[PDB]
Design a protein around this ligand. Structure first.
Ligand SMILES: CCCCCCCCCCCCCCCCCC(=O)OC[C@H](COP(=O)([O-])OCC(O)COP(=O)([O-])OC[C@@H](COC(=O)CCCCCCCCCCCCCCCCC)OC(=O)CCCCCCCCCCCCCCCCC)OC(=O)CCCCCCCCCCCCCCCCC
Ligand SMILES: CCCCCCCCCCCCCCCCCC(=O)OC[C@H](COP(=O)([O-])OCC(O)COP(=O)([O-])OC[C@@H](COC(=O)CCCCCCCCCCCCCCCCC)OC(=O)CCCCCCCCCCCCCCCCC)OC(=O)CCCCCCCCCCCCCCCCC
Ligand SMILES: CCCCCCCCCCCCCCCCCC(=O)OC[C@H](COP(=O)([O-])OCC[N+](C)(C)C)OC(=O)CCCCCCCCCCCCCCCCC
Lengths: 74, 49
């Protein structure tokens, strides 16, 4: 019957939408890898920033290492 | 059958470029900005339902 053949033909009309859905799925699986690599980027580039920005970005936890040299002069 | 019943243009004599048979297809087909080539045949844009 024409009706059934029409339904079967039309079953795949929306190919592009299904492909967009596929884009969404694979990117959802992939994108969390940005966190490891982001941490490492920041790890490497932290000692390049100004001392003030190092102190700020760590909420004051980070401070200049104390190795027993270059102390104040009376 | 037709190959042994038709005439052919290459079986007959011509001497000047102005006597060559003229193409059946029209020169006026493809249009648009910066399109050098004005004539094409085939494309793969998809068919509807
Ligand atoms: C204990 C029991 C034993 C258990 C055993 C179990 C087994 C496991 C072991 C565990 C035991 C300990 C072991 C020790 C391990 C650690 C030591 C270690 O590893 O040292 C290594 C050591 C490294 O030393 P180092 O690098 O000098 O260390 C310097 C420091 O890193 C200092 O460097 P730094 O200070 O410059 O570091 C910078 C750091 C600085 O870090 C900090 O200061 C962080 C502070 C941390 C605080 C801690 C918090 C957690 C604690 C909280 C407590 C919670 C309380 C609750 C619980 C208690 C109460 C309930 O900051 C960052 O990293 C960047 C910041 C974060 C980035 C992410 C971005 C976040 C943005 C924030 C957004 C929010 C807004 C901010 C904006 C502000 C405005 C609002 O090794 C060496 O020295 C090198 C060795 C030589 C080997 C070379 C390697 C091989 C090379 C050859 C290759 C060539 C051949 C070819 C290739 C071969 C291929 C095969
Ligand atoms: C604060 C101060 C402010 C000052 C503001 C001043 C603003 C001034 C703006 C001026 C804008 C002028 C353009 C107006 C376009 C109007 C378009 C329009 O109405 O479309 C309707 C309508 C749109 O419908 P459509 O469906 O697109 O149909 C058109 C087709 O698609 C068409 O396709 P088709 O298949 O039918 O035709 C064949 C197709 C394909 O043809 C080909 O492919 C043939 C190619 C043959 C090439 C042979 C070359 C051989 C020689 C080479 C020699 C070596 C050179 C290299 C080495 C030299 C050494 C370096 O032809 C073309 O693609 C023609 C391309 C024409 C390009 C003209 C470019 C003019 C640029 C003017 C300067 C603009 C600013 C520059 C940038 C500034 C910095 C950002 O188009 C038409 O009906 C056709 C109109 C075509 C008009 C073309 C001629 C325009 C003449 C304008 C004169 C302006 C004088 C300015 C003097 C200023 C004194 C101060
Ligand atoms: C895809 C990423 C590829 C990454 C390849 C990069 C490898 C080479 C990195 C070279 C970094 C050089 C930085 C230039 C500034 C000078 C450095 C220096 O010694 O300064 C003095 C400073 C110390 O300063 P100082 O005490 O000499 O005095 C100057 C004081 N400051 C710095 C405040 C102005 O030395 C360092 O701290 C060493 C520099 C560490 C920086 C390392 C950066 C690594 C970059 C990789 C990040 C990649 C993330 C992903 C990006 C991809 C995006 C698409």
């Amino acid at each position: 019957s024409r009706a059934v053949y029409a339904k079967l033909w039309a079953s795949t009309a929306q190919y592009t939408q299904r492909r967009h859905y596929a884009w969404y799925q694979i990117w959802s699986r992939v994108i969390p890898w940005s966190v490891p690599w982001g941490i490492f980027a920041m790890w490497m580039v932290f000692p390049a920033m100004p001392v003030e920005y190092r102190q700020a970005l760590t909420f004051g936890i980070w401070q200049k290492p104390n190795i027993g040299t270059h102390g104040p002069d009376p | 059958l037709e190959e042994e019943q038709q005439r052919k243009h290459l079986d007959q004599e011509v001497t000047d470029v102005s006597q060559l048979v003229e193409p059946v297809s029209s020169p006026h087909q493809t249009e648009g900005w910066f399109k050098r080539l004005r004539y094409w045949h085939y494309k793969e844009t998809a068919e509807p339902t």
